Scaffold this active site. Structure first.
Site, PDB file in Angstrom:
ATOM      1  N   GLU A 169      -3.218   0.561  -5.939  1.00  0.00           N
ATOM      2  CA  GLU A 169      -3.422   1.663  -4.999  1.00  0.00           C
ATOM      3  C   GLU A 169      -2.474   1.571  -3.811  1.00  0.00           C
ATOM      4  O   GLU A 169      -2.887   1.443  -2.660  1.00  0.00           O
ATOM      5  CB  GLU A 169      -4.896   1.675  -4.568  1.00  0.00           C
ATOM      6  CG  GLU A 169      -5.819   2.088  -5.722  1.00  0.00           C
ATOM      7  CD  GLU A 169      -7.270   1.679  -5.534  1.00  0.00           C
ATOM      8  OE1 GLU A 169      -7.719   1.561  -4.373  1.00  0.00           O
ATOM      9  OE2 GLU A 169      -7.965   1.492  -6.561  1.00  0.00           O
ATOM     10  N   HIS A 223      -8.373   2.823   0.053  1.00  0.00           N
ATOM     11  CA  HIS A 223      -8.197   2.865  -1.403  1.00  0.00           C
ATOM     12  C   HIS A 223      -7.493   4.139  -1.880  1.00  0.00           C
ATOM     13  O   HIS A 223      -7.125   5.008  -1.094  1.00  0.00           O
ATOM     14  CB  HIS A 223      -9.562   2.834  -2.104  1.00  0.00           C
ATOM     15  CG  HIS A 223     -10.308   1.542  -1.967  1.00  0.00           C
ATOM     16  ND1 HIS A 223     -10.462   0.662  -3.017  1.00  0.00           N
ATOM     17  CD2 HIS A 223     -10.987   1.006  -0.925  1.00  0.00           C
ATOM     18  CE1 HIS A 223     -11.205  -0.359  -2.629  1.00  0.00           C
ATOM     19  NE2 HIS A 223     -11.537  -0.175  -1.364  1.00  0.00           N
ATOM     20  N   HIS A 228      -7.306  -3.283  -4.303  1.00  0.00           N
ATOM     21  CA  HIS A 228      -6.906  -3.009  -5.683  1.00  0.00           C
ATOM     22  C   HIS A 228      -5.395  -2.815  -5.588  1.00  0.00           C
ATOM     23  O   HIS A 228      -4.918  -1.838  -5.010  1.00  0.00           O
ATOM     24  CB  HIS A 228      -7.621  -1.754  -6.184  1.00  0.00           C
ATOM     25  CG  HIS A 228      -9.102  -1.933  -6.309  1.00  0.00           C
ATOM     26  ND1 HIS A 228     -10.011  -1.014  -5.831  1.00  0.00           N
ATOM     27  CD2 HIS A 228      -9.834  -2.936  -6.850  1.00  0.00           C
ATOM     28  CE1 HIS A 228     -11.237  -1.442  -6.071  1.00  0.00           C
ATOM     29  NE2 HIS A 228     -11.158  -2.607  -6.687  1.00  0.00           N
ATOM     30  N   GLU A 259     -10.357   7.316   0.547  1.00  0.00           N
ATOM     31  CA  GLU A 259      -9.719   7.547  -0.743  1.00  0.00           C
ATOM     32  C   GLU A 259      -8.623   8.603  -0.723  1.00  0.00           C
ATOM     33  O   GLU A 259      -8.872   9.762  -0.402  1.00  0.00           O
ATOM     34  CB  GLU A 259     -10.774   7.960  -1.769  1.00  0.00           C
ATOM     35  CG  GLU A 259     -11.853   6.924  -2.053  1.00  0.00           C
ATOM     36  CD  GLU A 259     -11.360   5.770  -2.895  1.00  0.00           C
ATOM     37  OE1 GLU A 259     -10.260   5.877  -3.481  1.00  0.00           O
ATOM     38  OE2 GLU A 259     -12.082   4.754  -2.983  1.00  0.00           O
TER      39      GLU A 259
HETATM   40  N1  LIG Z   1     -18.735   3.954  -4.151  1.00  0.00           N
HETATM   41  C1  LIG Z   1     -17.962   3.420  -5.093  1.00  0.00           C
HETATM   42  N2  LIG Z   1     -18.505   2.994  -6.229  1.00  0.00           N
HETATM   43  N3  LIG Z   1     -16.652   3.308  -4.883  1.00  0.00           N
HETATM   44  C2  LIG Z   1     -16.078   3.789  -3.619  1.00  0.00           C
HETATM   45  C3  LIG Z   1     -15.509   2.621  -2.809  1.00  0.00           C
HETATM   46  S1  LIG Z   1     -13.978   1.891  -3.496  1.00  0.00           S
HETATM   47  C4  LIG Z   1     -14.221   2.222  -5.279  1.00  0.00           C
HETATM   48  C5  LIG Z   1     -13.169   3.202  -5.802  1.00  0.00           C
HETATM   49  C6  LIG Z   1     -11.750   2.642  -5.667  1.00  0.00           C
HETATM   50  O1  LIG Z   1     -11.541   1.512  -6.155  1.00  0.00           O
HETATM   51  O2  LIG Z   1     -10.899   3.361  -5.096  1.00  0.00           O
HETATM   52  C7  LIG Z   1     -14.210   0.928  -6.098  1.00  0.00           C
HETATM   53  O3  LIG Z   1     -14.150  -0.155  -5.473  1.00  0.00           O
HETATM   54  O4  LIG Z   1     -14.260   1.051  -7.339  1.00  0.00           O
HETATM   55 ZN   LIG Z   2      -9.726   0.901  -5.031  1.00  0.00          ZN
END
Ligand SMILES: N=C(N)NCCS[C@@H](CC(=O)O)C(=O)O
Ligand SMILES: [Zn+2]
Length: 375
Positions: A170, A260, A167, A335
């Site tokens: 981020e 992320h 993404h 995260e």
């Molecule tokens: N378990 C979930 N649903 N997400 C955690 C992994 S990345 C998540 C959060 C992020 O983008 O940081 C995503 O891909 O949306």
């Molecule tokens: Zn992400």
């Protein structure tokens, strides 16, 4: 004054900047998707001893609008030293104020990681002993997706994978990678000597160069959320993911970390694969081991994070879950916060590029301890 975002990762639409106490701006949606949250702009020609009040008028329509509460915008006069500024959130949008000490300043959702810095990181990595560019993918718009491999022993057997910033918004993700790679420069690092005698590192510093350059938040150039393309990747729509999966199939995977950033939660954490139909007691214990050892070494905690998935209810479209199950390996989505890591408050900067770099180095320490348990 004049405001602009015509540069790497820039994102903003100027509404009105004629009155310093009534500066109105809007965040721009992704190139080919409705998402938005990330912003980055420069202000020039500001008057001295003058309070400037900014408002992102469409913050309420952003992808994660509930995450604006408690968030403080980041700014910098030089692009090197970044600091947080007083911010508030209400029905009118995100507001932040600054009485600039210099005539020009930049604001961003997080300390930005440019593609120019990316190039420097890659150049630096290839100059380190045991580091080589194993493969290279191509983004929708023709930008490089480098896959680096760290191999210092011709007889190791484990493959530890770490990819970042699927993404684009981020940015803390590639900062994490810079810290990880810079640690490899150390001449005498006993922990890394132990780790690399048994494992090689497969690293992808940036999974979405197109999105990053264009100041996107969520999607690649074609408008695809890369972290929802792992179950059905496309060489046409999600070449970035298609590339990595091909390399994984050929070399194998014994560990996978997907880096992320989370807009809402003011804590560093990791999301595991407990919802995978392929989840096992072995993996359950390894996840526990990883979290415990990392919490003992870096800015990382366990209480806050995403809810755990009910048995077998994971979404295999996500990289963490897909890779973890396909290769039966320890896998986490790491995260880092856009706010601060509240366990260790540092309000002046909130979470930063430097702290992201440090977490990358502490993760390496954690992997060194767990190496004999991964398989
Ligand atoms: N378990 C979930 N649903 N997400 C955690 C992994 S990345 C998540 C959060 C992020 O983008 O940081 C995503 O891909 O949306
Ligand atoms: Zn992400």
């Amino acid at each position: 004054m004049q405001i602009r975002a015509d540069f790497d990762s820039g994102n903003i639409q100027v509404i009105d900047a004629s009155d310093p106490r009534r500066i109105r701006l809007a965040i721009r949606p992704d190139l080919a998707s409705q998402h938005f949250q990330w912003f980055h702009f420069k202000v020039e020609g500001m008057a001295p001893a003058t309070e400037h009040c900014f408002t992102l008028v469409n913050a309420g329509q952003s992808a994660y609008s509930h995450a604006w509460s408690g968030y403080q915008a980041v700014a910098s006069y030089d692009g090197e030293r970044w600091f947080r500024v007083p911010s508030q959130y209400d029905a009118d949008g995100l507001h932040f104020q600054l009485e600039p000490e210099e005539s020009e300043v930049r604001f961003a959702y997080f300390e930005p990681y440019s593609r120019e810095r990316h190039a420097r990181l890659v150049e630096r990595a290839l100059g380190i002993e045991g580091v080589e560019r194993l493969a290279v993918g191509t983004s929708v718009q023709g930008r490089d997706i480098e896959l680096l491999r760290v191999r210092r022993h011709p007889d190791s057997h484990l493959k530890l994978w770490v990819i970042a910033q699927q993404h684009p918004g981020e940015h803390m993700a590639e900062w994490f990678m810079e810290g990880l790679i810079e640690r490899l420069q150390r001449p005498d690092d006993t922990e890394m000597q132990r780790l690399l005698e048994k494992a090689d590192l497969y690293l992808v510093p940036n999974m979405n160069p197109d999105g990053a350059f264009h100041g996107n938040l969520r999607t690649n150039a074609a408008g695809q959320d890369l972290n929802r393309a792992w179950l059905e990747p496309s060489a046409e729509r999600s070449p970035e993911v298609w590339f990595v999966q091909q390399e994984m199939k050929r070399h194998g995977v014994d560990l996978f970390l997907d880096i992320h950033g989370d807009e809402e939660i003011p804590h560093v954490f990791a999301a595991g694969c407990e919802g995978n139909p392929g989840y096992t007691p072995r993996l359950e214990r390894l996840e526990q081991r990883f979290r415990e050892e990392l919490m003992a070494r870096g800015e990382f905690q366990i209480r806050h994070g995403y809810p755990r998935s009910a048995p077998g209810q994971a979404n295999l479209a996500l990289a963490c879950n897909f890779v973890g199950q396909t290769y039966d390996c320890l896998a986490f989505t790491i995260e880092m916060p856009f706010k601060d890591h509240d366990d260790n408050p540092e309000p002046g900067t909130g979470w930063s590029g430097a702290r992201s770099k440090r977490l990358g180095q502490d993760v390496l320490s954690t992997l060194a301890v767990l190496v004999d348990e991964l398989r």
